[PDB]
Design a protein around this ligand. Structure first.
Ligand SMILES: O=C(NCCCS)[C@@H]1CN(Cc2ccc(F)cc2)CCN1
Length: 371
Protein backbone atom coordinates (compact mmCIF):
# COMPACT_ATOMS: atom_id res chain seq x y z
CA UNK A 1 0.00 0.00 0.00
CA UNK A 2 3.07 2.21 -0.55
CA UNK A 3 5.95 2.94 -0.09
CA UNK A 4 7.97 0.34 -2.09
CA UNK A 5 11.40 1.83 -1.22
CA UNK A 6 13.39 -1.03 -2.80
CA UNK A 7 11.81 -0.54 -6.24
CA UNK A 8 12.18 3.27 -6.35
CA UNK A 9 14.85 4.48 -8.81
CA UNK A 10 15.42 1.06 -10.46
CA UNK A 11 15.35 2.37 -14.05
CA UNK A 12 18.38 3.79 -15.88
CA UNK A 13 19.01 5.00 -19.44
CA UNK A 14 20.10 7.65 -21.91
CA UNK A 15 18.03 10.29 -23.73
CA UNK A 16 16.25 8.68 -26.70
CA UNK A 17 17.61 5.17 -26.09
CA UNK A 18 14.95 3.76 -23.74
CA UNK A 19 14.57 2.94 -20.04
CA UNK A 20 16.00 -0.31 -18.66
CA UNK A 21 15.61 -2.31 -15.44
CA UNK A 22 18.18 -4.76 -14.07
CA UNK A 23 17.07 -8.41 -14.33
CA UNK A 24 18.59 -11.84 -13.69
CA UNK A 25 17.88 -14.94 -15.79
CA UNK A 26 18.80 -18.58 -15.09
CA UNK A 27 20.74 -20.29 -12.32
CA UNK A 28 23.46 -19.45 -11.48
CA UNK A 29 21.90 -15.96 -12.01
CA UNK A 30 23.11 -13.97 -15.02
CA UNK A 31 22.65 -10.20 -14.65
CA UNK A 32 21.21 -8.33 -17.66
CA UNK A 33 19.86 -4.81 -18.29
CA UNK A 34 16.42 -5.06 -19.91
CA UNK A 35 14.44 -2.26 -21.60
CA UNK A 36 10.88 -1.64 -20.35
CA UNK A 37 8.45 -1.80 -23.30
CA UNK A 38 4.67 -1.51 -22.82
CA UNK A 39 4.18 -1.46 -26.60
CA UNK A 40 5.12 -5.14 -26.99
CA UNK A 41 4.48 -8.38 -25.08
CA UNK A 42 7.61 -10.43 -25.75
CA UNK A 43 10.40 -10.92 -23.24
CA UNK A 44 13.47 -11.20 -25.48
CA UNK A 45 17.13 -11.08 -24.44
CA UNK A 46 20.42 -11.10 -26.38
CA UNK A 47 21.86 -14.62 -26.63
CA UNK A 48 24.60 -14.31 -29.27
CA UNK A 49 27.83 -12.22 -29.15
CA UNK A 50 26.68 -9.12 -31.07
CA UNK A 51 29.28 -6.27 -31.39
CA UNK A 52 27.06 -3.78 -29.49
CA UNK A 53 26.53 -6.11 -26.50
CA UNK A 54 28.88 -6.12 -23.49
CA UNK A 55 27.25 -9.35 -22.26
CA UNK A 56 24.55 -11.88 -23.20
CA UNK A 57 22.39 -14.83 -22.11
CA UNK A 58 24.28 -18.13 -22.15
CA UNK A 59 21.81 -21.04 -22.21
CA UNK A 60 24.50 -23.70 -21.72
CA UNK A 61 25.44 -22.31 -18.27
CA UNK A 62 21.87 -22.30 -16.94
CA UNK A 63 20.91 -25.54 -15.19
CA UNK A 64 17.27 -24.36 -15.33
CA UNK A 65 17.17 -23.73 -19.09
CA UNK A 66 14.49 -25.47 -21.17
CA UNK A 67 14.39 -25.47 -24.98
CA UNK A 68 10.95 -25.24 -26.62
CA UNK A 69 12.46 -25.99 -30.06
CA UNK A 70 10.47 -23.27 -31.85
CA UNK A 71 11.81 -20.35 -33.90
CA UNK A 72 10.44 -16.80 -34.03
CA UNK A 73 11.09 -13.86 -36.39
CA UNK A 74 9.96 -10.46 -35.10
CA UNK A 75 10.14 -7.19 -37.07
CA UNK A 76 10.89 -3.88 -35.35
CA UNK A 77 10.78 -0.34 -36.81
CA UNK A 78 13.87 -0.15 -39.06
CA UNK A 79 15.12 -3.72 -38.42
CA UNK A 80 14.23 -7.09 -36.86
CA UNK A 81 15.31 -9.65 -34.27
CA UNK A 82 15.31 -13.40 -34.89
CA UNK A 83 15.55 -15.87 -32.00
CA UNK A 84 14.81 -19.25 -30.41
CA UNK A 85 12.02 -19.81 -27.87
CA UNK A 86 12.56 -21.35 -24.42
CA UNK A 87 11.98 -20.98 -20.67
CA UNK A 88 14.07 -20.18 -17.56
CA UNK A 89 13.87 -18.72 -14.04
CA UNK A 90 13.74 -14.89 -13.98
CA UNK A 91 14.10 -12.33 -11.17
CA UNK A 92 14.29 -8.56 -10.69
CA UNK A 93 16.99 -7.60 -8.11
CA UNK A 94 15.55 -4.12 -7.48
CA UNK A 95 11.94 -5.35 -7.76
CA UNK A 96 9.62 -7.60 -5.72
CA UNK A 97 11.29 -10.46 -3.82
CA UNK A 98 10.19 -13.35 -6.07
CA UNK A 99 11.40 -15.71 -8.83
CA UNK A 100 9.28 -16.95 -11.76
CA UNK A 101 9.60 -19.47 -14.58
CA UNK A 102 8.83 -17.51 -17.75
CA UNK A 103 9.08 -17.66 -21.55
CA UNK A 104 12.30 -16.18 -22.93
CA UNK A 105 13.20 -15.44 -26.55
CA UNK A 106 16.93 -16.04 -26.99
CA UNK A 107 18.02 -13.43 -29.57
CA UNK A 108 20.49 -15.21 -31.87
CA UNK A 109 20.51 -12.72 -34.75
CA UNK A 110 19.42 -9.08 -35.08
CA UNK A 111 19.33 -6.43 -37.82
CA UNK A 112 19.20 -2.77 -36.70
CA UNK A 113 17.94 -3.62 -33.20
CA UNK A 114 20.52 -3.32 -30.40
CA UNK A 115 21.52 0.32 -30.06
CA UNK A 116 25.24 1.14 -30.08
CA UNK A 117 26.47 2.52 -26.76
CA UNK A 118 23.20 1.65 -24.98
CA UNK A 119 23.46 -0.37 -21.79
CA UNK A 120 20.45 -2.67 -22.28
CA UNK A 121 20.75 -6.16 -23.80
CA UNK A 122 17.05 -7.08 -24.03
CA UNK A 123 13.39 -6.09 -24.08
CA UNK A 124 10.55 -6.60 -21.58
CA UNK A 125 7.17 -6.67 -23.33
CA UNK A 126 4.58 -5.65 -20.74
CA UNK A 127 1.52 -5.47 -23.03
CA UNK A 128 -1.17 -8.16 -23.34
CA UNK A 129 -1.00 -11.65 -24.91
CA UNK A 130 -2.79 -10.81 -28.20
CA UNK A 131 0.16 -9.01 -29.84
CA UNK A 132 2.74 -11.48 -28.47
CA UNK A 133 4.65 -13.36 -31.18
CA UNK A 134 4.37 -15.98 -32.60
CA UNK A 135 0.82 -16.09 -31.18
CA UNK A 136 -1.47 -15.50 -28.17
CA UNK A 137 -0.46 -18.72 -26.36
CA UNK A 138 3.10 -17.61 -25.51
CA UNK A 139 2.32 -16.13 -22.08
CA UNK A 140 4.01 -12.69 -21.59
CA UNK A 141 6.38 -12.12 -18.64
CA UNK A 142 4.00 -10.08 -16.47
CA UNK A 143 1.10 -12.54 -16.83
CA UNK A 144 3.35 -15.36 -15.61
CA UNK A 145 4.56 -13.32 -12.61
CA UNK A 146 1.01 -12.56 -11.42
CA UNK A 147 -0.09 -16.20 -11.84
CA UNK A 148 3.02 -17.63 -10.14
CA UNK A 149 3.23 -15.16 -7.21
CA UNK A 150 1.05 -13.05 -4.90
CA UNK A 151 2.05 -9.83 -6.71
CA UNK A 152 -1.09 -7.78 -7.53
CA UNK A 153 -1.95 -7.30 -11.22
CA UNK A 154 -0.76 -3.69 -11.47
CA UNK A 155 2.42 -1.74 -12.22
CA UNK A 156 3.39 1.94 -12.44
CA UNK A 157 6.10 3.84 -14.30
CA UNK A 158 7.78 7.17 -13.63
CA UNK A 159 10.25 8.25 -16.30
CA UNK A 160 12.39 11.27 -15.38
CA UNK A 161 14.03 13.32 -18.14
CA UNK A 162 17.18 15.44 -18.00
CA UNK A 163 18.38 9.81 -17.18
CA UNK A 164 16.56 7.51 -14.73
CA UNK A 165 13.19 6.52 -13.29
CA UNK A 166 11.09 4.05 -11.28
CA UNK A 167 9.20 0.86 -12.15
CA UNK A 168 6.92 -0.22 -9.30
CA UNK A 169 5.67 -3.79 -9.77
CA UNK A 170 2.50 -4.37 -7.75
CA UNK A 171 1.52 -0.98 -6.33
CA UNK A 172 1.25 2.81 -6.35
CA UNK A 173 3.99 4.85 -4.68
CA UNK A 174 2.93 8.27 -3.38
CA UNK A 175 6.49 9.68 -3.26
CA UNK A 176 6.46 9.64 -7.06
CA UNK A 177 3.51 11.95 -7.76
CA UNK A 178 1.59 15.05 -6.68
CA UNK A 179 -2.11 15.94 -6.90
CA UNK A 180 -4.75 13.42 -7.94
CA UNK A 181 -4.94 10.32 -10.17
CA UNK A 182 -7.36 10.29 -13.11
CA UNK A 183 -8.16 6.99 -14.87
CA UNK A 184 -8.79 6.49 -18.59
CA UNK A 185 -10.24 3.05 -19.42
CA UNK A 186 -8.43 0.48 -21.55
CA UNK A 187 -10.67 -0.16 -24.56
CA UNK A 188 -9.16 -3.52 -25.55
CA UNK A 189 -6.45 -5.67 -24.00
CA UNK A 190 -3.75 -5.99 -26.68
CA UNK A 191 -1.77 -2.78 -26.63
CA UNK A 192 -2.61 -0.33 -23.85
CA UNK A 193 -5.30 1.30 -25.98
CA UNK A 194 -6.87 4.59 -24.85
CA UNK A 195 -9.27 7.17 -26.30
CA UNK A 196 -8.30 10.81 -26.94
CA UNK A 197 -11.42 13.01 -27.14
CA UNK A 198 -9.85 16.49 -27.61
CA UNK A 199 -6.45 18.09 -28.29
CA UNK A 200 -5.43 21.68 -27.42
CA UNK A 201 -2.33 23.75 -28.18
CA UNK A 202 -2.22 26.50 -25.52
CA UNK A 203 -5.95 25.97 -24.97
CA UNK A 204 -6.56 26.23 -28.73
CA UNK A 205 -8.87 23.44 -29.92
CA UNK A 206 -7.66 21.85 -33.16
CA UNK A 207 -11.34 21.56 -34.21
CA UNK A 208 -10.58 18.12 -35.71
CA UNK A 209 -12.91 15.12 -35.54
CA UNK A 210 -12.05 13.21 -32.35
CA UNK A 211 -11.97 9.95 -34.33
CA UNK A 212 -8.96 11.33 -36.26
CA UNK A 213 -6.93 11.58 -33.03
CA UNK A 214 -7.38 7.84 -32.53
CA UNK A 215 -7.07 6.91 -36.23
CA UNK A 216 -6.04 3.24 -36.10
CA UNK A 217 -5.52 3.45 -32.30
CA UNK A 218 -4.05 5.50 -29.43
CA UNK A 219 -1.49 3.67 -27.27
CA UNK A 220 0.74 4.32 -24.25
CA UNK A 221 4.20 3.05 -25.19
CA UNK A 222 7.20 3.21 -22.83
CA UNK A 223 9.46 1.89 -25.61
CA UNK A 224 8.78 4.75 -28.04
CA UNK A 225 10.90 7.87 -27.51
CA UNK A 226 8.95 10.58 -29.35
CA UNK A 227 5.30 11.63 -29.39
CA UNK A 228 3.77 10.17 -32.55
CA UNK A 229 0.63 11.45 -34.27
CA UNK A 230 -1.44 10.35 -37.34
CA UNK A 231 -0.69 12.17 -40.63
CA UNK A 232 -3.68 14.56 -40.42
CA UNK A 233 -3.25 15.21 -36.67
CA UNK A 234 0.52 15.76 -36.95
CA UNK A 235 -0.06 18.37 -39.69
CA UNK A 236 -2.37 20.54 -37.55
CA UNK A 237 -0.19 20.13 -34.44
CA UNK A 238 3.00 21.38 -36.14
CA UNK A 239 0.98 24.24 -37.68
CA UNK A 240 -0.23 25.46 -34.27
CA UNK A 241 3.13 24.88 -32.53
CA UNK A 242 4.75 26.92 -35.32
CA UNK A 243 2.04 29.58 -34.88
CA UNK A 244 2.55 29.90 -31.11
CA UNK A 245 6.36 30.11 -31.37
CA UNK A 246 6.19 33.03 -33.86
CA UNK A 247 8.78 35.13 -31.98
CA UNK A 248 11.68 33.02 -33.30
CA UNK A 249 11.79 31.33 -36.72
CA UNK A 250 13.13 27.78 -37.11
CA UNK A 251 14.51 25.95 -40.21
CA UNK A 252 11.85 24.00 -42.15
CA UNK A 253 13.53 20.63 -41.46
CA UNK A 254 13.49 21.07 -37.67
CA UNK A 255 9.75 20.31 -37.40
CA UNK A 256 10.24 16.94 -39.14
CA UNK A 257 12.90 16.09 -36.54
CA UNK A 258 15.81 15.93 -38.99
CA UNK A 259 17.45 19.16 -37.75
CA UNK A 260 18.91 20.42 -34.47
CA UNK A 261 17.99 23.79 -32.91
CA UNK A 262 20.25 25.46 -30.32
CA UNK A 263 20.43 28.42 -27.94
CA UNK A 264 23.03 29.93 -25.59
CA UNK A 265 23.57 28.33 -22.14
CA UNK A 266 20.53 28.64 -19.87
CA UNK A 267 18.86 31.18 -22.18
CA UNK A 268 16.47 28.55 -23.62
CA UNK A 269 13.19 30.41 -24.38
CA UNK A 270 10.70 27.96 -22.83
CA UNK A 271 7.88 30.53 -22.69
CA UNK A 272 7.94 31.03 -26.49
CA UNK A 273 6.67 27.45 -26.90
CA UNK A 274 3.06 26.32 -26.25
CA UNK A 275 1.73 23.55 -24.01
CA UNK A 276 -0.06 20.49 -25.44
CA UNK A 277 -3.18 19.15 -23.73
CA UNK A 278 -4.62 15.71 -24.53
CA UNK A 279 -8.14 15.12 -23.23
CA UNK A 280 -8.74 11.46 -22.37
CA UNK A 281 -12.04 9.59 -21.77
CA UNK A 282 -13.03 9.34 -18.08
CA UNK A 283 -14.48 6.40 -16.15
CA UNK A 284 -17.83 8.15 -15.59
CA UNK A 285 -20.29 8.73 -18.47
CA UNK A 286 -19.97 12.07 -20.32
CA UNK A 287 -16.77 12.79 -18.38
CA UNK A 288 -13.15 13.39 -19.41
CA UNK A 289 -9.83 14.80 -18.17
CA UNK A 290 -6.89 16.61 -19.78
CA UNK A 291 -3.18 15.92 -19.40
CA UNK A 292 -0.73 18.72 -20.18
CA UNK A 293 2.93 18.61 -21.24
CA UNK A 294 5.48 21.43 -21.40
CA UNK A 295 8.10 22.09 -24.10
CA UNK A 296 10.55 20.56 -21.60
CA UNK A 297 8.81 17.29 -22.50
CA UNK A 298 8.69 17.55 -26.32
CA UNK A 299 12.04 19.30 -26.78
CA UNK A 300 14.69 16.61 -26.28
CA UNK A 301 18.25 17.60 -25.19
CA UNK A 302 21.19 16.26 -27.24
CA UNK A 303 25.10 25.87 -25.70
CA UNK A 304 21.97 23.77 -25.14
CA UNK A 305 20.54 21.92 -28.15
CA UNK A 306 17.17 20.22 -28.65
CA UNK A 307 15.38 18.00 -31.19
CA UNK A 308 11.66 18.46 -31.84
CA UNK A 309 10.37 15.18 -30.41
CA UNK A 310 6.99 15.05 -32.18
CA UNK A 311 6.88 12.86 -35.31
CA UNK A 312 4.26 11.54 -37.76
CA UNK A 313 2.85 8.01 -37.56
CA UNK A 314 1.06 5.75 -40.03
CA UNK A 315 0.27 3.32 -37.19
CA UNK A 316 -1.85 5.57 -34.93
CA UNK A 317 -1.22 7.80 -31.92
CA UNK A 318 1.77 6.76 -29.81
CA UNK A 319 1.90 8.47 -26.41
CA UNK A 320 5.61 7.68 -26.01
CA UNK A 321 8.34 8.74 -23.56
CA UNK A 322 7.76 12.45 -24.33
CA UNK A 323 4.21 12.18 -22.93
CA UNK A 324 5.20 9.78 -20.14
CA UNK A 325 8.10 11.88 -18.81
CA UNK A 326 5.59 14.44 -17.52
CA UNK A 327 3.42 12.07 -15.50
CA UNK A 328 3.19 9.14 -13.11
CA UNK A 329 1.51 6.45 -15.20
CA UNK A 330 -0.30 3.64 -13.37
CA UNK A 331 -1.07 0.59 -15.52
CA UNK A 332 -3.99 -0.81 -13.51
CA UNK A 333 -4.33 -4.06 -15.49
CA UNK A 334 -6.79 -5.79 -13.13
CA UNK A 335 -9.33 -2.95 -13.39
CA UNK A 336 -8.96 -2.38 -17.17
CA UNK A 337 -7.70 1.21 -16.78
CA UNK A 338 -4.65 3.49 -16.96
CA UNK A 339 -4.09 6.25 -14.39
CA UNK A 340 -2.48 9.67 -14.86
CA UNK A 341 -1.04 12.11 -12.30
CA UNK A 342 1.60 14.87 -12.29
CA UNK A 343 5.13 13.44 -12.00
CA UNK A 344 7.15 14.56 -8.98
CA UNK A 345 10.42 14.35 -10.93
CA UNK A 346 9.23 15.90 -14.23
CA UNK A 347 11.28 18.75 -15.72
CA UNK A 348 9.76 22.24 -15.41
CA UNK A 349 10.54 25.94 -14.96
CA UNK A 350 9.29 28.38 -12.28
CA UNK A 351 6.32 29.67 -14.28
CA UNK A 352 4.77 26.51 -15.81
CA UNK A 353 4.13 22.92 -14.71
CA UNK A 354 2.80 19.69 -16.23
CA UNK A 355 -0.86 19.22 -15.27
CA UNK A 356 -3.67 16.71 -14.83
CA UNK A 357 -7.10 18.31 -14.43
CA UNK A 358 -10.77 17.26 -14.52
CA UNK A 359 -13.60 16.53 -14.78
CA UNK A 360 -14.66 17.99 -18.14
CA UNK A 361 -18.13 17.41 -19.61
CA UNK A 362 -17.85 15.79 -23.06
CA UNK A 363 -20.62 14.18 -25.14
CA UNK A 364 -20.46 11.36 -27.74
CA UNK A 365 -17.11 9.96 -26.54
CA UNK A 366 -17.67 6.47 -28.03
CA UNK A 367 -17.65 8.01 -31.54
CA UNK A 368 -13.96 8.87 -31.05
CA UNK A 369 -13.08 5.17 -31.16
CA UNK A 370 -12.04 3.64 -34.48
CA UNK A 371 -12.96 0.29 -36.06
O1 LIG B 1 10.45 3.38 -30.62
C1 LIG B 1 11.25 4.14 -31.15
N1 LIG B 1 10.88 5.04 -32.05
C2 LIG B 1 10.09 4.69 -33.22
C3 LIG B 1 10.96 4.43 -34.44
C4 LIG B 1 10.10 4.29 -35.70
S1 LIG B 1 9.36 2.64 -35.75
C5 LIG B 1 12.72 4.08 -30.81
C6 LIG B 1 12.89 3.51 -29.41
N2 LIG B 1 14.32 3.26 -29.28
C7 LIG B 1 14.58 2.42 -28.11
C8 LIG B 1 13.99 1.05 -28.36
C9 LIG B 1 14.66 0.14 -29.19
C10 LIG B 1 14.10 -1.12 -29.42
C11 LIG B 1 12.89 -1.47 -28.82
F1 LIG B 1 12.35 -2.68 -29.05
C12 LIG B 1 12.22 -0.56 -28.00
C13 LIG B 1 12.77 0.69 -27.77
C14 LIG B 1 15.06 4.52 -29.21
C15 LIG B 1 14.81 5.25 -30.53
N3 LIG B 1 13.39 5.37 -30.88
Amino acid sequence: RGSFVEMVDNLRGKSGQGYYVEMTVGSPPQTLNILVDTGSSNFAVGAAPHPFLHRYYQRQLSSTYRDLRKGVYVPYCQGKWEGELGTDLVSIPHGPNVTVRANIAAITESDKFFINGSNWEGILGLAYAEIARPDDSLEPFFDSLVKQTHVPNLFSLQLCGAVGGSMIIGGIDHSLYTGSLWYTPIRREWYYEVIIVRVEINGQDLKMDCKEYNYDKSIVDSGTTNLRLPKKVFEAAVKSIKAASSTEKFPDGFWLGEQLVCWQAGTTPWNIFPVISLYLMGEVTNQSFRITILPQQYLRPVDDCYKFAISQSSTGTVMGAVIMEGFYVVFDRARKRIGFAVSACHVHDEFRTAAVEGPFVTLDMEDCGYN
